[PDB]
Design a protein around this ligand. Structure first.
Ligand SMILES: CNC(=O)c1c(F)cccc1Nc1nc(Nc2cc3c(ccn3C(=O)CN(C)C)cc2OC)nc2[nH]ccc12
Length: 285
């Protein structure tokens, strides 16, 4: 493992980063809420998420932390959480990401339940909002597929929610309840198995983040899904999203839609800004 990171236009002066509070444990270590001065042209200050590697990390893990930041430089998708800057001079290394103020999608969904103690005084997602979420997630996944990344871990806990409620793909032992039968059987992960996970995300949206296969152990889920089992439809689930889930959960991975096919299905009734920001409508597609 050697440093591929070139201290370039992405390099941010450490003193430009002010840390406000802990947000929680990320993959590599603590994630902080921060404020960054003059990192984006036209903005004097930018709210940011700041990732760090935990103190127990090896030298290798620190190098791998910085190499991941280097990879993220190549991504410019509105529906994938974006890198803003890197502090690689001295320790600790800081990886500065766009802030997603409403946190992960699973927790956000669970907050909108009628019984929730942390309910923000708003109704649960409307059909329109759920379709919008689905399209945004699908577009972000379409982009990563075009970049030749198989996600392997798609779940509501791994999607993030912005200030304006835009949903984006976040960070990319086994999550068996989100896994396709062929992955459970042979450990084969493809964009087609990512599509299976996408259907589970739709199920999480329409159940306000219930635990998939509640009342079944992980061993029972493994067998159930490999045998051709899949999730039941949530109570009063909109027909349109039920239809998407059905496609996603075809046993033959060849018979599942692609992420571009999903966006295309949903494109005719989305927010006006969608074609201006999406990978789907971009010249890159
Ligand atoms: C892979 N996990 C993370 O990166 C992560 C985490 F594990 C915990 C907390 C934050 C993480 N990452 C990011 N968070 C945010 N915004 C954000 C998330 C928040 C909260 C409060 C609970 N949150 C959770 O998501 C807790 N949840 C994991 C249970 C506040 C936030 O901004 C005000 N923006 C981000 N941008 C890039 C990473 C990131």
């Amino acid at each position: 493992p050697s440093s591929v990171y070139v201290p370039d236009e992405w390099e941010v002066s450490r003193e430009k980063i002010t840390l406000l509070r802990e947000l929680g444990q990320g993959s590599f270590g603590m994630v902080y809420e921060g404020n960054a001065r003059d990192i984006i042209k036209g903005e004097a200050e930018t709210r940011v998420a700041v990732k760090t590697v935990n103190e127990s990390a090896s030298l290798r893990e620190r190098i791998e932390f910085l190499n991941e930041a280097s990879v993220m430089k190549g991504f410019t998708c509105h529906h994938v959480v974006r890198l803003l800057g890197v502090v690689s001079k001295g320790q600790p290394t800081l990886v500065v990401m766009e802030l997603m103020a409403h946190g992960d999608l699973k927790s956000y969904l669970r907050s909108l339940r009628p019984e929730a103690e942390n309910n923000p005084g708003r109704p649960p997602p409307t059909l329109q909002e759920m379709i919008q979420m689905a399209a945004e997630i699908a577009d972000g996944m379409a982009y990563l597929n075009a970049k030749k990344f198989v996600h392997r871990n798609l779940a509501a806990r791994n999607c993030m929610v912005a200030h304006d409620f835009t949903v984006k793909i976040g960070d990319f032992l086994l999550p068996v309840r989100w896994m396709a039968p062929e992955s459970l059987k042979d450990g084969v992960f493809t964009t087609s198995s990512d599509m299976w996970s996408f259907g589970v995300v739709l199920w999480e949206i329409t159940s306000l983040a219930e635990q998939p296969y509640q009342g079944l152990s992980n061993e029972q889920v493994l067998k159930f899904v490999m045998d051709g089992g899949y999730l039941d439809q949530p109570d009063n689930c909109p027909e349109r999203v039920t239809d998407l889930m059905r496609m996603c959960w075809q046993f033959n991975p060849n018979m599942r839609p692609t992420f571009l096919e999903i966006v295309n299905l949903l494109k005719d009734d989305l927010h006006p800004s969608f074609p201006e920001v999406s990978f789907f409508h971009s010249e890159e597609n």
